[PDB]
Amino acid sequence: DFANLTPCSENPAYLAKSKNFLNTTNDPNSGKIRAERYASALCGPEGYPHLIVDGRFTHAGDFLIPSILFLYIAGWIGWVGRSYLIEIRESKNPEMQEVVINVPLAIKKMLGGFLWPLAAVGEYTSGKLVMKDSEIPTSPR
Amino acid sequence: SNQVVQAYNGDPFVGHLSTPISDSAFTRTFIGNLPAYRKGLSPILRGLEV
Amino acid sequence: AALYTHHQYIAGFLMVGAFAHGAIFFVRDYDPVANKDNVLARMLEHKEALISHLSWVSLFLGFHTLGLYVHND
Amino acid sequence: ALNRGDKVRIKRTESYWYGDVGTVASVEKSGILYPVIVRFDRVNYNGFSGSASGVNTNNFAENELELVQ
Amino acid sequence: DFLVHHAIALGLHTTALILIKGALDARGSKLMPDKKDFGYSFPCDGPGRGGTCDISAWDAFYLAMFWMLNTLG
Amino acid sequence: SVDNNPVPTSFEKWGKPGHFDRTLARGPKTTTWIWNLHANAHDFDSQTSDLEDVSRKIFSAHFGHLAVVFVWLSGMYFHGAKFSNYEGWLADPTHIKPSAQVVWPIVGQGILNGDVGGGFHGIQITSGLFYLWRASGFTDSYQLYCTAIGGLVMAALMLFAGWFHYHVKAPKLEWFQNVESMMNHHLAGLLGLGSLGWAGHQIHVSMPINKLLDAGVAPKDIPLPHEFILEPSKMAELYPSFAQGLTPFFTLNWGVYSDFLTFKGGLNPVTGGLWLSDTAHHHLAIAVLFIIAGHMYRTNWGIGHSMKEILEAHKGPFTGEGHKGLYEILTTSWHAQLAINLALLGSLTIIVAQHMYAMPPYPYQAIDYATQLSLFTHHMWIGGFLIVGAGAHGAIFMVRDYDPAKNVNNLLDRMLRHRDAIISHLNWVCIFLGFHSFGLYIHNDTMRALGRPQDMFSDTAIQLQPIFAQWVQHLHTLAPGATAPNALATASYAFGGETIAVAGKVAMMPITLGTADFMVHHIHAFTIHVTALILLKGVLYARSSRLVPDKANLGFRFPCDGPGRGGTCQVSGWDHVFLGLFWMYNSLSIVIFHFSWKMQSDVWGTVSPDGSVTHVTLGNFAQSAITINGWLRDFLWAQAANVINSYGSALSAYGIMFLAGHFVFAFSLMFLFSGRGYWQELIESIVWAHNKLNVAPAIQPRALSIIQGRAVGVAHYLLGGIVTTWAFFLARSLSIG
Amino acid sequence: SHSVKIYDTCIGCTQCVRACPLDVLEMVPWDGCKAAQIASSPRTEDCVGCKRCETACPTDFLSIRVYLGAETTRSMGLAY
Amino acid sequence: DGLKSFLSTAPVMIMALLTFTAGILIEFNRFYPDLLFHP
Amino acid sequence: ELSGQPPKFGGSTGGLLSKANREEKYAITWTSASEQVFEMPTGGAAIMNEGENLLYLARKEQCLALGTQLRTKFKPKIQDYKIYRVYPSGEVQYLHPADGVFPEKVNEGREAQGTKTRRIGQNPEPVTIKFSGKAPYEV
Numbered sequence A: 001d002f003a004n005l006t007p008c009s010e011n012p013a014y015l016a017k018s019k020n021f022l023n024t025t026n027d028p029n030s031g032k033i034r035a036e037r038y039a040s041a042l043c044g045p046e047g048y049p050h051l052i053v054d055g056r057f058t059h060a061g062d063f064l065i066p067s068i069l070f071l072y073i074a075g076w077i078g079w080v081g082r083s084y085l086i087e088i089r090e091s092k093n094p095e096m097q098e099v100v101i102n103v104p105l106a107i108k109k110m111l112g113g114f115l116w117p118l119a120a121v122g123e124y125t126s127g128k129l130v131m132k133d134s135e136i137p138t139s140p141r
Numbered sequence B: 001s002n003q004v005v006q007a008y009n010g011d012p013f014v015g016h017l018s019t020p021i022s023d024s025a026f027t028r029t030f031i032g033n034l035p036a037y038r039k040g041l042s043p044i045l046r047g048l049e050v
Numbered sequence C: 001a002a003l004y005t006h007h008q009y010i011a012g013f014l015m016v017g018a019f020a021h022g023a024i025f026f027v028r029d030y031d032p033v034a035n036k037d038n039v040l041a042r043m044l045e046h047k048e049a050l051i052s053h054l055s056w057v058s059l060f061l062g063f064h065t066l067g068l069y070v071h072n073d
Numbered sequence D: 001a002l003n004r005g006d007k008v009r010i011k012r013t014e015s016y017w018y019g020d021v022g023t024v025a026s027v028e029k030s031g032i033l034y035p036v037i038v039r040f041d042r043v044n045y046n047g048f049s050g051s052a053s054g055v056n057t058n059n060f061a062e063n064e065l066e067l068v069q
Numbered sequence E: 001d002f003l004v005h006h007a008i009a010l011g012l013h014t015t016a017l018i019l020i021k022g023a024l025d026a027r028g029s030k031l032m033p034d035k036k037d038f039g040y041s042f043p044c045d046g047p048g049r050g051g052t053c054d055i056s057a058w059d060a061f062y063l064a065m066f067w068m069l070n071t072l073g
Numbered sequence F: 001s002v003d004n005n006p007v008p009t010s011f012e013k014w015g016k017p018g019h020f021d022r023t024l025a026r027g028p029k030t031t032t033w034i035w036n037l038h039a040n041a042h043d044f045d046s047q048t049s050d051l052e053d054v055s056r057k058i059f060s061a062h063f064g065h066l067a068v069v070f071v072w073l074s075g076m077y078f079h080g081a082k083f084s085n086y087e088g089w090l091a092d093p094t095h096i097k098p099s100a101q102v103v104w105p106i107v108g109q110g111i112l113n114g115d116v117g118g119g120f121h122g123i124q125i126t127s128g129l130f131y132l133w134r135a136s137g138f139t140d141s142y143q144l145y146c147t148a149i150g151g152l153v154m155a156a157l158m159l160f161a162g163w164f165h166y167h168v169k170a171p172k173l174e175w176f177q178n179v180e181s182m183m184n185h186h187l188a189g190l191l192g193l194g195s196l197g198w199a200g201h202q203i204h205v206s207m208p209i210n211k212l213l214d215a216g217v218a219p220k221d222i223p224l225p226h227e228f229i230l231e232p233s234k235m236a237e238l239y240p241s242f243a244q245g246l247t248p249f250f251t252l253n254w255g256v257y258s259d260f261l262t263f264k265g266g267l268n269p270v271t272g273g274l275w276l277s278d279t280a281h282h283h284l285a286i287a288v289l290f291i292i293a294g295h296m297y298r299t300n301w302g303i304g305h306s307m308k309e310i311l312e313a314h315k316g317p318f319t320g321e322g323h324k325g326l327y328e329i330l331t332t333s334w335h336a337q338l339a340i341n342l343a344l345l346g347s348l349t350i351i352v353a354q355h356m357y358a359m360p361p362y363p364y365q366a367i368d369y370a371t372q373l374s375l376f377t378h379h380m381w382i383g384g385f386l387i388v389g390a391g392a393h394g395a396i397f398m399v400r401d402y403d404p405a406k407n408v409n410n411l412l413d414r415m416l417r418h419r420d421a422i423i424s425h426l427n428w429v430c431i432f433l434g435f436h437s438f439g440l441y442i443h444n445d446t447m448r449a450l451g452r453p454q455d456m457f458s459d460t461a462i463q464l465q466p467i468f469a470q471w472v473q474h475l476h477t478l479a480p481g482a483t484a485p486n487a488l489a490t491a492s493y494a495f496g497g498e499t500i501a502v503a504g505k506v507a508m509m510p511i512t513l514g515t516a517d518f519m520v521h522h523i524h525a526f527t528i529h530v531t532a533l534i535l536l537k538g539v540l541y542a543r544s545s546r547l548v549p550d551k552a553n554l555g556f557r558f559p560c561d562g563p564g565r566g567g568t569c570q571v572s573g574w575d576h577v578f579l580g581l582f583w584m585y586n587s588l589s590i591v592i593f594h595f596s597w598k599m600q601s602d603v604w605g606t607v608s609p610d611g612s613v614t615h616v617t618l619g620n621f622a623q624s625a626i627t628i629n630g631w632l633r634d635f636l637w638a639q640a641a642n643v644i645n646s647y648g649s650a651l652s653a654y655g656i657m658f659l660a661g662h663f664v665f666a667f668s669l670m671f672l673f674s675g676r677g678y679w680q681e682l683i684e685s686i687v688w689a690h691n692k693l694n695v696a697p698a699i700q701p702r703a704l705s706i707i708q709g710r711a712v713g714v715a716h717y718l719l720g721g722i723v724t725t726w727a728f729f730l731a732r733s734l735s736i737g
Numbered sequence G: 001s002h003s004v005k006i007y008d009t010c011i012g013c014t015q016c017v018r019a020c021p022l023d024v025l026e027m028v029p030w031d032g033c034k035a036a037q038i039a040s041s042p043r044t045e046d047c048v049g050c051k052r053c054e055t056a057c058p059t060d061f062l063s064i065r066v067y068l069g070a071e072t073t074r075s076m077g078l079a080y
Numbered sequence H: 001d002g003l004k005s006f007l008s009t010a011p012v013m014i015m016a017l018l019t020f021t022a023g024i025l026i027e028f029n030r031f032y033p034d035l036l037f038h039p
Numbered sequence I: 001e002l003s004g005q006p007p008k009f010g011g012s013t014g015g016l017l018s019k020a021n022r023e024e025k026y027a028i029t030w031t032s033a034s035e036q037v038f039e040m041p042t043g044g045a046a047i048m049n050e051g052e053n054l055l056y057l058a059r060k061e062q063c064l065a066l067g068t069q070l071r072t073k074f075k076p077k078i079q080d081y082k083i084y085r086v087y088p089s090g091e092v093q094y095l096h097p098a099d100g101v102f103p104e105k106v107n108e109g110r111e112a113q114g115t116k117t118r119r120i121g122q123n124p125e126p127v128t129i130k131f132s133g134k135a136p137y138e139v
């Protein structure tokens, strides 16, 4: 599999470059630990590491782990914002709290987003997530 | 008075001004005696001189 | 190079003209009574869904292509 | 038929609030083509370019409103 | 090739988005519901109702010309 | 006449945005509210209708602006003392480049900490701070730290003064209207006494360490600036005129002081800067003339002038009632004063840019070509922006503060009465200039492309010699000794003379003027005339035209009066500002491109020991700058190789901004080519999608207004283009060497 | 000339007539609204098409509509 | 109590959150740099 | 004929062009209680006489902008101005206010023109009126 590419520790361009990888931070070992981390990847003929997003489990660090972490965080952000918008709708001036943000209820929801997909499927199953087409405002069709 | 800038032909609401460039006596006697404006000329003589 | 570029430019012009003359059809030639409940009027019915989903996928593509290109640069 | 305080849905097929819910403020007397005053929480587009708000009330007929209560 | 293919995808999607929004709002929108009475090509509906420059479907053709040229480039 | 506690100081109104505008204080309904808020903050004439409170707000805002400028200057002195190499550069000027910004090593950005000299890693600063600090006599990091601390204290003083003059003790209107005293206090005060104090500083402090550093004394061996004033024997040791004291000053015998106050001219041939004795004598003469000027007008003692009487006496047979009424305009309208001040200050900043390169006043600034190019271009851009703002506030005065009953048959009324003649003749001039400069370039491109170089406009072909500028250059060359007998050298060697060759580099030579200079100067004349035409038509037609007779009722800032009358979009004065911004941008881009190419081609370079100079681009301006293709290939394409081959080096940030400006300019075209109806309908579709998942915001989202769309477009266009040119210019001139 | 039409949602606020800078519109008596007046456009040959009347109209989906049509010297606002 | 609501205005919260997230990212980079995948 | 003294004016370039003597011009007459300064709609300031004032302008919009200024920018509001259209044959046609009453106020005898008995949204489709030469709003 992946015959056009090579493992990095065999690709001699990768060794010739990773002998001289520049240290990003003040740690002198930064280029060396970069080389040690990138040697386990799949490098091209030019020596730079290439990532596979097909869904290979051994390439889970290439796509799968950061994608599911981004999905978890994006669901946290979206559910916190959605629950804040649902809660502040029943107020005297819901536009005021949208532009001068009420801190404590926002903080209460911010430390409340660690169970978001269960809340999402519960709100979907209880009809609190999707409205009807007749209920929403529509342009002249 | 001493004001050399006046209304064009005495009408202040016509969009022009009586200026020493536009309506001096030299301007009228020069432009009006150019062949395109010279009085009594046949148009072939005007065109010929131009 | 000249042939490929010429034909892709002509293709872009023709596709834009197709969508423009479809808009002209909707302005001048479309009968909402004769086309009631068929595919044309149904496309009119959920036009917000189509426009919003195209906008979402355009934002998706542009965001991530520009992010990867700028990260690489 | 409708009275003040009810919530209704706009069915004019041309208004900004078609699909939005509005509240009945008052109903004018008979002989009036569009008697019922409907107020809305969301303003419309009305105003010169650069205006920060629009109008939030409109005049409708009885058949253009659907009672939702 | 992969990055520029996703850029090409973005260009195709955005040009289609402009053209489809123009074709499906040619008859009317919430900002201008009697657009079919004004025709395919007209300048605007004035500065009223917030301002309505480039509201016709002709203007959406005109906007999509730029994105078509961008994708073809 | 000072009020006592007009406005209380409370923290409550900080938390309610939109307090200043009556419509904004109701709360947000559409997103335009937010965009209105920042748009309506500083329009003090619109919030309150009384001139008094507007003047109070302006005075306190001026103090706040001065505080901001002092914070910036304090930060500059702090970054020049802690995170700089002013120590090290000062002992060795021409081995070490100036660098006053140190960047943390993070995410690989420590590559930007480039080797500038003496074991330093930082960004090579091109603002010229080191050369001015050397010209002022700075020699230690502790004194720069003291200056930074003093700048922080003065910023706190400015903030306290603004708070005091708005909230506690605030002046009345006739304090502001007393402009007769204000001009005396600004001429004999600020400018005159400031230049007298700086001349005293020059003579006492800046001259000794400068002349000792030019002599060869190490900076540690020059002790400290105060011990000169502790012991006056050091001046008589160095300038032997300091023996008679202050006696020849008061006894009309000023020729005793002709040893530290001179009329040499030219440049110091150790540094390339101006002579410090020349600048001190200039500052002293400027001080005396400004003190004399600041006793013109009657203030409190019945002696002086009335500016009203002077204006009212100036009238002629052509101009009716003359300057009658201009005092009332300039004492009641802040906008009219802002217009004329912005015009003169922008012209002054442009004059500063043009005078600073040809007479470099700072040591080693001239041989730093990056610093010279940066300072010229920065001051040009500042001046052009201020001139556009002048046209803006002239139109704003015309819309808001003009009154026809109180201007009858004066100059301003006659301007409004013959604006058609003015604008039509300016239109004809602009077309004539565009043809007879740019079509000369087009002619040259076509004749070179057709293989007819003998038919071009060039020095080797049909010649366009700028003979008047050459004659004036000749008269400046024969000035010092014939028409300026006491002047030793010429005012600048750009007019004619010999080449100053500080280190291996060039500082100034005779800038010769041929056909290409003629062509590019008429291009400058054309572009300046078009920018002036746009802004002057915006001023003269801000109130009415034959198209829209009631334009003053629509205001200064409105998109249009509808699609009717053929179409009336961009009729407002604000839209004339919008268009003049692009045309000023075009004008100044060409001005700075002319400067960069001519300085690299016929001035800058490397001097041989025999006396020959190898220029940076080897004199290609005479043959390549006559075509558009030459500007494209030999100027843009050739010199952009430094900015695009910067990746992987310390100049790579200049690469990134070279991309980044290219983004923003193109991003601008989205706002510039489109209209808000499309964007509003698209927003309706996205709001329907938000309605489906109940994420509709309470503040309703709208498209930007037409004016705001134009503003975003012009802002992004100018930002992207200026960032692109900045990156290109800096990566070229940090690689010229 | 341009066409100015007035539809039956007019509530007689007279704001379109006040906003019109070319004296196109009047208010005539009516019975369809509580104000008992409806806008009218007898002078559409003087209409320039500026749509100020549309901007002034407070009814949602405006009761006055201007349609730009045939272009004349008066309609293009020409002083020459 | 108006300063508490002045901080509660939208630009102050969004800049505070941006500084917090940027500080987290910069600190995670300056502790553990050069991560393209999961080792 | 049209009567009134011309307001005293120095002259301007913004005034009448050849359209005035070729196609049409417009006239505005108003009575003034005193001599005060007004703003010309063609740029600049003019002085209106005491009594009758007759001003010639290029467009109807200029006359109506002047009339708006007369009604709104003077403490005694000049509310009696008449705007006429003047043809080069000499015929003067009275324009504004047409019935003697300003059009923002209702008057009997005014006929409803441009009024539609249908709503804005019940205009018929364009496809129903093809090859007829008439728009949806004209039917």
Ligand code: CLA
Binding pocket: C055, C056, C058, C059, C060, C061, C062, C063, C066, E010, E014, E017, E018, E063, E064, E066, E067, F663, F666, F667, F668, F669, F670, F671, F673, F674, F682
């Ligand atoms: C280089 C120029 C440029 C760019 C970046 C865009 C970008 C966009 N256009 Mg576009 N446009 C342009 C030129 C450009 N246009 C021109 C010249 C025209 C002709 C007039 C148009 C006409 C046009 C139309 C007609 C339409 C678009 C649409 C879009 C959006 C599509 C979504 C997308 O691609 O990904 C998302 C966005 C991007 C990749 C760009 C923004 C990403 C930025 C850089 C992220 C960083 C933001 C930054 C943090 C902000 C802080 C600012 C701070 C420094 C002050 C997007 C906002 C469509 C749309 O809205 O679809 C939803 C649409 O209908 N545009």
Ligand code: CLA
Binding pocket: F007, F008, F009, F010, F011, F013, F014, F019, F020, F056, F057, F058, F060, F061, F063, F064, F065, F067, F068, F071, F159, F160, F161, F162, F163, F166
């Ligand atoms: C802690 C002291 C204090 C307090 C309680 C107030 C309180 C008030 N001021 Mg005030 N002011 C202060 C200091 C203070 N000010 C200072 C130091 C100055 C001199 C610059 C002024 C100048 C000033 C003017 C000219 C005006 C007010 C007004 C007001 C009132 C309305 C609130 C407001 O402006 O919106 C809240 C506004 C903000 C929070 C804006 C913050 C500042 C922005 C971001 C610009 C930053 C520049 C800044 C002014 C100076 C540089 C900052 C520095 C770090 C370098 C309010 C009662 C206005 C008024 O009367 O209301 C009708 C008014 O016209 N003040």
Ligand code: CLA
Binding pocket: F038, F039, F040, F041, F042, F043, F044, F338, F342, F385, F386, F387, F388, F389, F390, F392, F396, F557, F574, F577, F715
């Ligand atoms: C001495 C200088 C001076 C002064 C005192 C004023 C004062 C004023 N101007 Mg003015 N102006 C100036 C220079 C000046 N201007 C210049 C140089 C120009 C030419 C560009 C203009 C153009 C101009 C226009 C076109 C308008 C004004 C307006 C105003 C008034 C309100 C300002 C306002 O809305 O604030 C709020 C200001 C803003 C919201 C602008 C902020 C956004 C800018 C464009 C960002 C610029 C980019 C930035 C430098 C870098 C971005 C970095 C980013 C990537 C992080 C006020 C009387 C306005 C007005 O109401 O007139 C009465 C108006 O319409 N002026």
Ligand code: CLA
Binding pocket: F427, F428, F430, F431, F432, F433, F434, F435, F438, F439, F442, F530, F533, F534, F579, F582, F583
């Ligand atoms: C490169 C693009 C470009 C060009 C050529 C022009 C050209 C012009 N602009 Mg302009 N403009 C541009 C971009 C451009 N603009 C942009 C981007 C903006 C947006 C902000 C504006 C905004 C703008 C304003 C706001 C104004 C102008 C003005 C002008 C005119 C200046 C007078 C002049 O030079 O006449 C001479 C004409 C030229 C130099 C054009 C080139 C002519 C060539 C060299 C000769 C061709 C020979 C022959 C005719 C070819 C015929 C071929 C045959 C087969 C028929 C001129 C027509 C001003 C104006 O009208 O003032 C009088 C004015 O007020 N423009």
Ligand SMILES: CCCCCCCCCCCCCCCC(=O)OC[C@H](COP(=O)(O)OC[C@@H](O)CO)OC(=O)CCCCCCCCCCCCCCC
Binding pocket: F314, F315, F316, F317, F318, F319, F320, F322, F323
């Ligand atoms: C580049 C240098 C070499 C070329 C120079 C060419 C000069 C061009 C022609 C002369 C312009 C004459 C104006 C002054 C003469 C002048 O000031 O007259 C004086 C006259 C004012 O006369 P009064 O006696 O009424 O003046 C009393 C005053 O105190 C004001 O009340 O002004 C006018 O008549 C205004 C009309 C100017 C109409 C001319 C417009 C100028 C357009 C040309 C601008 C070109 C400048 C080019 C050089 C920068």
Ligand SMILES: CC1=C(/C=C/C(C)=C/C=C/C(C)=C\C=C\C=C(C)\C=C\C=C(C)\C=C\C2=C[C@H](C)[C@H](O)CC2(C)C)C(C)(C)C[C@@H](O)C1
Binding pocket: A053, A054, A055, A063, A074, A075, A076, A077, A078, A079, A080, A082, A120, F693
């Ligand atoms: C849940 C949530 C929301 C609601 C969200 C909605 C409404 C989602 C609507 C969704 C629909 C209607 C359809 C979804 C289609 C979704 C799809 C198709 C799949 C995307 C592909 C996924 C796993 C597979 C991806 C491949 C398969 C495999 C994993 C490979 O390795 C990689 C790769 C990319 C090839 C918000 C937005 C309102 C707020 C949030 O906080 C919560």
Ligand SMILES: CC1=C(/C=C/C(C)=C/C=C/C(C)=C/C=C/C=C(C)/C=C/C=C(C)/C=C/C2=C(C)CCCC2(C)C)C(C)(C)CCC1
Binding pocket: C015, C018, C019, C021, C022, C023, C025, C026, E023
């Ligand atoms: C791959 C492959 C395949 C498959 C194929 C396919 C499946 C295809 C498809 C294709 C397609 C799928 C295509 C598409 C296209 C589309 C388009 C491009 C569209 C367009 C549109 C338009 C243009 C529209 C228009 C309009 C309007 C707008 C309105 C009115 C109407 C109308 C219609 C006119 C096969 C098997 C062979 C083999 C292998 C390979």
Ligand SMILES: CC1=C(/C=C/C(C)=C\C=C\C(C)=C\C=C\C=C(C)\C=C\C=C(C)\C=C\C2=C(C)CCCC2(C)C)C(C)(C)CCC1
Binding pocket: F069, F189, F190, F193, F194, F195, F198
């Ligand atoms: C433009 C600009 C700039 C510059 C500026 C400058 C640098 C200036 C200077 C200025 C100056 C430089 C000034 C000064 C002045 C001074 C004053 C104002 C003072 C006064 C006071 C007083 C009161 C005094 C007193 C006294 C006496 C009288 C005697 C003796 C003793 C004493 C001294 C105490 C900058 C770059 C920054 C920024 C940008 C722009």
Ligand code: SF4
Binding pocket: E043, E044, E045, E046, E047, E051, E052, E053, E054, F559, F560, F561, F562, F563, F564, F567, F568, F569, F570, F675, F706
């Ligand atoms: S600015 Fe926009 S709304 Fe106004 S006339 Fe022009 S296109 Fe129409």
Ligand SMILES: [Cl-]
Binding pocket: F448, F624, F627, F629, F630
């Ligand atoms: Cl060439």
